[PDB]
Structure 1
């Protein structure tokens, strides 16, 4: 809609609306270019009127961003595709297409036939995918020299929590291997959130400690009830004890209170009998889902019993399969006279409870059903732990994502700065329109590093010099070795020495957005017979 308008519905009728669409689309695509990366400046973006979102994640914003154009539709669409796809490249897929939708359609009408135009991107979108998957040269959690420790360290080294890459390098190595959850279809990869990751504002930033078995989190400060016996075994219970209401769910509408008050008097005794009967089968530490109330927290502690209650079920579940207990076997109803067996006994070498840092847990030591491990973080404050935890998480997910992809390609546009030339070369000798096109592909691969480092204030010429100073004619080859360093640190914005770090993305999240972004250049094209409805 530009010029004197005799037609509605985004008709500037051709190159105008084409341009207006490349005006439209790119006007969305610019939010990312600055938002690219965490060092990429966040944007405080009103969702409705007074509802502001602060996001440097593009497709996250592109979900806030609403579609007023066919250009606006698809970029939100395709980035939200890549968004729900991974989450790596949400930002990234948005940037280059704005140029790629600024380029090929110009050739698409320069068609001898319209198809050969985008294929200049496409076989280049392949030629890169080849070159991409060819990259083990940076981003290696597949192997370090000490294998994952140094790689996790290089991850932690590419980060700063404070002092890191020390117990945390090791800690990443635990976390995946600490997870025996076998991801479906024979995937040798271990969910990194399946780890029990515990945190202490005590001790030291660098300090962290693995625990034998999964560490059960027992509520602290809330138990006048004994949780503590040192034994080999535990009883993991899915079950709870309440003296106020256990047998009583019924309404007060009953004409006589008689029934409710008298069973209420029976409810308390069996909760004292239930604990002992989970004690008498050989479990003195008895891990119960608990969740007793406030004034009910009074009722047990004053009257007395022993059960481990209010525990994290996530741990209690993990500890359940860890030690070999059963949260539910004969337990169905709620009662203190309910039958109990030894099938709920968890098997550990010992079951100990160690308090440290002013934090205590129920430690299931050497869980006999499955190998289990929980690392407990040590900060100087609760602040330090969110740093180490997520700096770990940088390696962690990547380590798993490197378990997902052996081919693991350099994070940062230094992968593209190569591809922005080799394919720019792969343009000319191609000849004709894809010569035209493959350069349009490659020459536009330059924009991610510029913007990103501009976002990190490492900018363009330096970065793009350094990136392609590495790559030569002498260095054309992905290799693994750096006289061409094809890596770029995202947070630095300047390419660095981290070849192993978990700040770099595997080939998984990469080959896609190539296909994604060019689709946006494709997707807008698709019209036959531009018209208007009235």
Structure 2
């Protein structure tokens, strides 16, 4: 911090050498330097940010998942928090902003314990006994989500994930959208275990009216253009057959290394004809099957387009692999990589075709989308987001994508807990009485671990531009009486948090904000494992590149 140290005094290293508490201080400032951009983005009162790529392009982002991934940091101690933000997005999909703040403060608050001659091995042991004591207390205080006869255990869950976004005001409209979407795309596996594949719904970047008037599609929406303009755009009538092909349908050459050689020039035209005919024989049998709509991964040549225009078939090129599996899964078809069977003959059976009620191509602000609705075998869903531009919709795309992961977890695990820093304030009262029981040096480690957990409710008040100590002192008073509740419900002074729009302490159950308990579990372990990685480092050895 003060000055640079001596460069390899009687050590003979090509790179730099540093040791002592100086690098330990640099890791604290390194974790705090990358955490300051995450501070202002926490809670509903947080504001968004924009990252410029020095080419004019910019992107608005609130969550610290992709912000820290875009910020190219060269200090390796900061890379662990960068990967921690990416790690938490994969498993849980929510709380990337919280683990960076929690992990940074645990290292910041533990920095005072370093110069007290408390070893890091004793500090992490005091943190770990506080962790498993906190997990059991979280397992005591949580609650199942069937919860009540009315739903609204899913309408309220969406508000927590939808808060701190541009469309947080429209969360009342989008709360019904996300719950209706994930209940349509469920599946069955492992003999009774229900799964909810995230990203299976199609998020379209449309422009137009507003985010409030975003129409929920009762079915999947394919984002691709029509091949020819002379084709029929709208196909009515029930039992519309869906064909999902992937083989190469355009005219292709012979095998990858063979050479066509012929002596008799009479058959030179005939081999040209059958190469043009062998590709049309495949299109002939699809017309015999009567598939109104056909989808292909590869291209579609003009030799095939004439047959679809004549027979009124909807041929669409330039489909992707991951989409057609969901089309076949929803419409009831099966993925056809090639047309063949166990016998030597080549044919096409009608069982490979799907079924849907209606297919309509719609265009909105230079965005052609094929609206497939009314799947008979299994339902599907897609959300057409509408806003100002593509870069504003990227925040909405991440806002919706994080909302599916949160609503995924509350259905997989019915246990939930209230927001507003309730459990973060409750663990402090639980750990203070436990810190005195253990006696020896781990009291300060467990105590300072509890003090670091209060940063989540404190940051909600700091970013709100209000008085923070009064809200924290009132939240401290109610949680202080929870441990001394004196059971005989009348077990009140629990399940309360901050209300920032009004600045009062009210019941979070009635306010309608909840979060699954599994997000709290994985966030605490991943935050502490990152804290263990930084505390145990003593000396750095940076080797310059050759």
Q: TM-score range by the shorter chain?
A: 0.7 to 0.9
Equivalent of 1:365, from 371, 374, 384? 374
Tell me if the contact between 2:247 and 2:337 (Cα under 8 Å) persists in the aligned partners.
Answer: no
Rounded Cα–Cα distance in structure 2 between residues aligned with 1:274 and 1:504: 55
Q: Is the partner of 2:381 in helix, strand or coil?
A: strand
Residue of structure 2 equivalent to 1:444: 452
Tell me if the contact between 1:133 and 1:408 (Cα under 8 Å) persists in the aligned partners.
Answer: no
How do 1:259-278 residues align onto structure 2 when only pairs under 5 Å count?
274-278=282-286
Residue of structure 2 equivalent to 1:237: 244
Q: Is the partner of 1:352 in helix, strand or coil?
A: strand
Residue of structure 2 equivalent to 1:188: 194
CA RMSD of aligned residues (A): 5.4
User: Structure 1 stretches of 5 or more lacking a match?
Assistant: none
Residue of structure 2 equivalent to 1:224: 230
Distance 1:268 1:41, change over 3 A: same
Please report how far the alpha carbon of residue 512 of structure 1 lies from its aligned counterpart in structure 2 after TM superposition. 3.2
Equivalent of 1:179, from 172, 182, 185? 185
Please report how far the alpha carbon of residue 354 of structure 1 lies from its aligned counterpart in structure 2 after TM superposition. 4.8
Tell me if the contact between 1:236 and 1:287 (Cα under 8 Å) persists in the aligned partners.
Answer: yes
Rounded Cα–Cα distance in structure 2 between residues aligned with 1:25 and 1:79: 13
How do 1:87-166 residues align onto structure 2 when only pairs under 5 Å count?
88-104=94-110, 107=113, 115-136=121-142, 145-148=150-153, 150-151=155-156, 154=159, 161=167
1:157-215 Cα distance to aligned partner (Å, 9 max, x none): 8577498567744433332221233466964331242235678768883563453x656
Q: Is the partner of 2:351 in helix, strand or coil?
A: coil
Residue of structure 1 equivalent to 2:5: 5
Please report how far the alpha carbon of residue 43 of structure 1 lies from its aligned counterpart in structure 2 after TM superposition. 6.3
Q: Is the partner of 1:225 in helix, strand or coil?
A: coil
Tell me if the contact between 1:136 and 1:407 (Cα under 8 Å) persists in the aligned partners.
Answer: yes
Distance 1:141 1:402, change over 3 A: farther
Residue of structure 2 equivalent to 1:434: 442
Rounded Cα–Cα distance in structure 2 between residues aligned with 1:388 and 1:30: 23
Rounded Cα–Cα distance in structure 2 between residues aligned with 1:72 and 1:508: 26
Rounded Cα–Cα distance in structure 2 between residues aligned with 1:54 and 1:81: 21
Rounded Cα–Cα distance in structure 2 between residues aligned with 1:461 and 1:10: 45
Residue of structure 2 equivalent to 1:526: 536
Residue of structure 2 equivalent to 1:343: 351
Residue of structure 1 equivalent to 2:411: 403
Tell me if the contact between 1:475 and 1:483 (Cα under 8 Å) persists in the aligned partners.
Answer: no
Rounded Cα–Cα distance in structure 2 between residues aligned with 1:414 and 1:114: 29
Tell me if the contact between 1:324 and 1:346 (Cα under 8 Å) persists in the aligned partners.
Answer: yes
Residue of structure 1 equivalent to 2:11: none
1:403-434 Cα distance to aligned partner (Å, 9 max, x none): 34333333453431333444345434554433
Please report how far the alpha carbon of residue 344 of structure 1 lies from its aligned counterpart in structure 2 after TM superposition. 1.8
Equivalent of 2:520, from 482, 502, 510? 510
Residue of structure 2 equivalent to 1:285: 292
Rounded Cα–Cα distance in structure 2 between residues aligned with 1:489 and 1:165: 17
Q: Does 1:308 align with 2:309?
A: no
Tell me if the contact between 2:419 and 2:508 (Cα under 8 Å) persists in the aligned partners.
Answer: no
Higher mean C-alpha deviation, range 372-381 or range 414-423: 372-381
Tell me if the contact between 2:92 and 2:406 (Cα under 8 Å) persists in the aligned partners.
Answer: no
1:73-107 Cα distance to aligned partner (Å, 9 max, x none): 65556666556654544432332444433444654
Distance 1:412 1:268, change over 3 A: farther
Distance 1:266 1:483, change over 3 A: farther
Please report how far the alpha carbon of residue 372 of structure 1 lies from its aligned counterpart in structure 2 after TM superposition. 1.9
How do 1:23-38 residues align onto structure 2 when only pairs under 5 Å count?
23-36=29-42
Using the size of structure 1 for normalisation, the TM-score is 0.72
Using the size of structure 2 for normalisation, the TM-score is 0.71
Residue of structure 2 equivalent to 1:484: 494
Please report how far the alpha carbon of residue 441 of structure 1 lies from its aligned counterpart in structure 2 after TM superposition. 1.0
